[PDB]
Design a binder for this molecule. Sequence first.
Ligand SMILES: CC(=O)N[C@H]1[C@@H](O[C@H]2[C@@H](O)[C@@H](CO)O[C@@H](O)[C@@H]2O[C@@H]2O[C@@H](C)[C@@H](O)[C@@H](O)[C@@H]2O)O[C@H](CO)[C@H](O)[C@@H]1O
Ligand SMILES: [Ca+2]
Length: 171
Amino acid sequence: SRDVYLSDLDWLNATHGDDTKSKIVQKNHPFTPGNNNQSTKISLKMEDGSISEFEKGLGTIAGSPSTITYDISGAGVTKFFSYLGIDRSANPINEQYAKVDKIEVVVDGKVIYSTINQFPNGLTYETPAIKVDLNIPENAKRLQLKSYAGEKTWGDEVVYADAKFTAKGDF
Ligand SMILES: CC(=O)N[C@H]1[C@@H](O[C@H]2[C@@H](O)[C@@H](CO)O[C@@H](O)[C@@H]2O[C@@H]2O[C@@H](C)[C@@H](O)[C@@H](O)[C@@H]2O)O[C@H](CO)[C@H](O)[C@@H]1O
Ligand SMILES: [Ca+2]
């Protein structure tokens, strides 16, 4: 097997909760600064509270939900890894900002991982990153990363940091 960053693959579709649809989901930047063509790296508050920067990942704005879909048919994907969280670049100006109800990993229509199980009240700017290290079912065809904004999308700068598949085959 080998590891491949999701950001080094093309998605089938990528939808976000930002009002400006000309902005696009980002590879290897958080959503807002990346659409601004800044060099700002993805960064998250880690389990111990420290901030880590990442070279690789995906940057989106949560939506109802916002969905990134990959066609992983015949690829032999056996594992998915990512940190999940709200990028540090987000601005927690008040309690309505940077509040994400849940993030799911869905494979062929089945939720195989959800933050709701450990974080029933969702993610906030100061929730520590969540380490997702996940077996992927044999013969799977579609994988979707879904981030749910809840009441508003403000500040919902969701990053899939270090997001990568492990795969026995080719995409
Ligand atoms: C300053 C800040 O953190 N902005 C993020 C936030 O943006 C939206 C809110 O601030 C909202 C409050 O009513 O106003 C919206 O105008 C604003 O949208 C942002 O700014 C406008 C001018 C456009 O450029 C929009 O594309 C842009 O999103 O929440 C969004 C997600 O909805 C982003 O995280 C912003 O970084
Ligand atoms: Ca929200």
